[PDB]
Amino acid sequence: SSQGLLGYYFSDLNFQAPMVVTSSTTGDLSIPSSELSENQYFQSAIWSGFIKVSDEYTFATSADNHVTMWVDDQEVINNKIRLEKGRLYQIKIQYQRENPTEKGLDFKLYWTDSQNKKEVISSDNLQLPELKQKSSSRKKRPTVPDRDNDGIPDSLEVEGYTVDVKNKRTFLSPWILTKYKSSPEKWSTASDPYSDFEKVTGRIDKNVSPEARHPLVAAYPIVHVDMENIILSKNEDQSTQNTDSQTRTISKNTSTSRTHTAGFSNSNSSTVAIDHSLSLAGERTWAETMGLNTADTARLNANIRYVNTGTAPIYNVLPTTSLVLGKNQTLATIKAKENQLSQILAPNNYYPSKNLAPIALNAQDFSSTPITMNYNQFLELEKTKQLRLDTDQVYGNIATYNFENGRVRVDTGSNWSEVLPQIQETTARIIFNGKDLNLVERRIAAVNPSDPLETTKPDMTLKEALKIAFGFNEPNGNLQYQGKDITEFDFNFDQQTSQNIKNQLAELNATNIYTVLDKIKLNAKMNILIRDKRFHYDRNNIAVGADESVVKEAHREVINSSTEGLLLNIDKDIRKILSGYIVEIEDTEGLKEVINDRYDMLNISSLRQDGKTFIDFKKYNDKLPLYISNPNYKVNVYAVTKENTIINPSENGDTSTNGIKKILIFSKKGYEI
Ligand SMILES: [Ca+2]
Ligand SMILES: [Ca+2]
């Protein structure tokens, strides 16, 4: 159904002005007018492909007077020819007719066998041309200019084309739907493993991201590891003979973010934050809790998933990951067995899938290496409550389209490691956080003025890149991402990119980038980082806070209040930058009673299934509503942002909230509750 002969239909008599490129599954090579105005008249056509059958055959068409046909460079129409089973023969057909009186083309290709049965050639017999960068049994190729052999004529790639689905196939036509342009000299304009033609005609792995079906958007995996929770325990040692002692482990939830530190690194990394909120009774040190003496060792287990935030899937190799304490203390290497993956790792997805159990670093597996820390490393983890996961870019084999059989299959001859460098060298990179404040990278084909091949690509503007790579749209004068104007996001660039864009702005006599996005041209190797302006970002470009005015405004909508808590509607992005809340009762003279007065007791908010947030005053008040002794006392509630969050007791041991920088978000007298 994606298989057959490939046809080019031209409005002129001499194969210069292709109006339609499309394939036919059978010898019926017609395009009726209903699938198509002054240029619906076709004066020439070329069809290309292969035939596979053992007999003497006679070829004929419905217009033999206007046709030349070759079977492997032997002219068969301008004859019984012998064809053998199990063999592939090249087919080329040319058709020319001056001043046709009907629109479209009625054209059929027949053959007659030695029992004199004549019929339109069936689908089982016809195959597409080998539109690849190398020949396979099937070579590549009255020549349509097609310098890169992807199947799209030079002129269309340069001038602009559209693809439309008509019944059961794709018509590729000149632009007068999405307007495509691509390099006529790059089989894959994004330097990825899928051709410009494969992409736009759907002859491609169904798991490739929708946006990466544009020839100007790169299709490649981007993988990091998400750690969901951790369990720490004292290692057994040769000196301790008895193993029957009580459970003394520390179990914590963890939050992991993919990071970016703009920059030039194509490295994968994620940073893990270990929850500091109360989980065990007492206020013990981690050593005290687990009974670690100064000569003991501890180990760590965790649950993880791999995340693919890129645009193409992985099939047979997961990348290797280092788990790192502090700057460079590697605690573990995490690997998966090659060629034994339980599933695909698709774009915008996880491995294992979220409907399945995550992976335990030490699986309930005789050979799993313990993830051990010495005593000083353990104390460092307790202090920092951070780990890092550095993942390589080793992604294995690629599922490619095969023109012989019209199937996509993992090709042991094709490997992501042969493609990534060229993608990185020839594209502009944009990292955007508009999807839930998580950093998502895309790469867009962009000219490199210094590399002659890369100058054969279309100009990529900043506006178009944002539209095609991230789905920005323009409904009514103004570029937007899911309702949010582009002006709600900032632009940051690496040093070279910044100078380039500065010089462009100067050349345009433009002082504001947001009003000339359609005029700013991207170049290969640019790095652009675009972040939601509402937020404060750490050195990893993780959102960790927001200005007080933003935070206050975000808590203005109170549904209900009582001595039990607050019920509010709070934007999802704002919730992401808080560690918790502090509740206080303020008496008439201005003295304050802090109710949950501990750095590990701020986790009092929860998101209900109706999407509203409840801030629970009872949780750390011994399960009791607030006692307000005089109705003129105030109940004050403060938000604590991540960047302001205390994760350890103070140097002198104080576990209270004294001196924590907090933002007042609710204040009402007792009689107002
Ligand atoms: Ca081409
Ligand atoms: Ca091309």
Distance from the first to the final alpha carbon of the chain: 68
User: Contact, 80 vs 90, CB < 8 A?
Assistant: no
| Coil, strand or helix at 459 | coil
Q: Are residues 524 and 550 in the same domain?
A: no
Breaks (C-N over 2.5 A) in the chain follow: 36, 53, 78, 136, 141, 176, 261, 364
Do 83 and 208 have their domain in common? yes
Q: Which of 219, 238, 259 is the last residue of a domain?
A: 219
User: Which residues lie closer than 8 Å to 423 by C-beta, 6 or more apart?
Assistant: 190, 191, 192, 218, 220, 443
**Which of 203, 193, 195, 127 lies closest to 157, judged by CA?**
195
Query: What are 397's strand-pairing partners?
Result: 415
For the CA of 18, the nearest ligand: 1
Return the bridge partners of 359, or none.
Answer: 304
Q: Would you list which residues are annotated within the binding site for Ca(2+)? A: 146, 148, 150, 152, 157, 183, 186, 196
Q: List the structure tokens of 159.
A: 């001038």
Tell which of 483, 515, 543 closes a domain: 543
Beta-bridge partner residues of 5: 24
Is the same domain home to 449 and 359? no
Say how many Å lie between the CA of residue 550 and the centre of ligand 1: 51
528 close to 493: Cβ distance less than 8 angstroms: yes
CA–CA–CA angle 266, 267, 270 (5° rounding): 130
Residue 304 near residue 371 (C-beta atoms within 8 A): no
Q: Give 205 Cα–ligand 1 centroid separation in angstroms.
A: 20
Sheet with 605-607, side-by-side order of all strands: 558-562, 565-568, 613-616, 605-607
Domain stops at, among 398, 424, 450: 424
Rounded CA-CA distance 202/235 in Å is: 54
Return d(Cα 188, Cα 117) in angstroms, integer: 43
Contact between 321 and 227 under an 8 Å Cβ cutoff? The reply is no
DSSP 3-state of 672: helix
Sign for the pseudo-dihedral over CA of 145, 146, 152, 158: negative
- Ligand nearest the Cα of residue 186 is 2
Report the number of distinct structural domains present in the chain.
Answer: 4
Give start and end residues of each alpha helix (H) in 217-298: 286-290
Q: Which of 596, 398, 411, 456 is nearest to 148 (CA)?
A: 456
CA of 191 to the centre of ligand 2 (A): 10
Question: Is the torsion defined by CA of 139, 145, 147, 150 positive or negative?
Answer: negative
514 and 401 share one domain: no
In whole angstroms, give the CA distance from residue 124 to residue 367: 51
Domain at 438, CATH number: 3.10.20.110
Query: Which pair of tokens denotes residue 436?
Result: 């839930």
183 and 240 part of one domain: no
Q: Provide the 3-class DSSP secondary structure of residue 166.
A: strand
Q: Are residues 519 and 605 in the same domain?
A: no
| DSSP-assigned letter for residue 286 | H
Question: 337 C-alpha to center of ligand 1: Å?
Answer: 39
CATH of the domain at 380: 2.60.120.240
Q: Is the peptide bond before 475 cis (omega within 30 degrees of 0)?
A: no
CATH of the domain at 633: 2.60.40.810
* Structure determined by: X-ray
299 and 190 in a common domain? no
DSSP strand pairing (397-402 vs 407-415): antiparallel
The CATH number covering residue 184 comes to: 3.90.182.10
Select from 306, 333, 323 the least CA-distant residue to 381. 323
534 with 567, same domain?
Answer: no
CB of 321 within 8 A of CB of 391?
yes
Contact (CB, 8 A) for 640 and 579: yes
Contacts of 122 (CB under 8 A, 6+ apart): 26, 27
Looking at the structure, tell me whether residues 418 and 438 fall in a common domain. no
Ligand 2 center to 157 CA (angstroms): 7
Closest to 189 (Cα-Cα) out of 428, 454, 463:
454
Sheet containing 634-641: order of strands: 592-594, 578-586, 634-641, 663-669
Q: Which of 254, 224, 249 minimizes the C-alpha distance to 647?
A: 254
Q: What is the resolution of this structure in A?
A: 1.7
State in Å: Cα 105 to ligand 1 middle: 24
Give the DSSP letter string of 531-560.
Answer: EETTEEE-TT--EEEE-HHHHHHHT--EEE
Judged by its nearest atom, the ligand closest to the C-alpha of residue 215 is 2
55 and 201 both lie in a single domain = yes
Helix (H) or strand (E) holding 157: helix 154-159
Residue 141, CA distances (Å) to 137, 312, 326, 404 in order: 13, 30, 58, 14
Residue 491 near residue 549 (C-beta atoms within 8 A): no
Q: Considering all CA atoms of the chain, what is the largest pairwise distance in Å, rounded to the nearest integer?
A: 111
Q: Which residues make up each annotated binding site?
A: 146, 148, 150, 152, 157, 183, 186, 196
Structural domain containing residue 360 = 220-424
Q: Which ligand is nearest to the CA of 155?
A: 1
> How far apart are alpha carbons 105 and 18 in whole angstroms?
14
CA of 394 to the centre of ligand 2 (A): 27
Rounded distance between C-alpha atoms, residue 220 and residue 224, angstroms: 14
Q: Are 227 and 272 in contact (CB under 8 A)?
A: yes
Contact 80, 89 (CB under 8 A): no
* Dihedral pair phi/psi, residue 14, rounded to 5°: -120, 40
Two tokens, residue 61: 């068409």
287 in the same domain as 208:
no
Specify whether the CB–CB gap between 361 and 227 falls below 8 A.
no
Separation of CA 185 and ligand 2 centre (Å): 6
Q: Are residues 189 and 252 in the same domain?
A: no
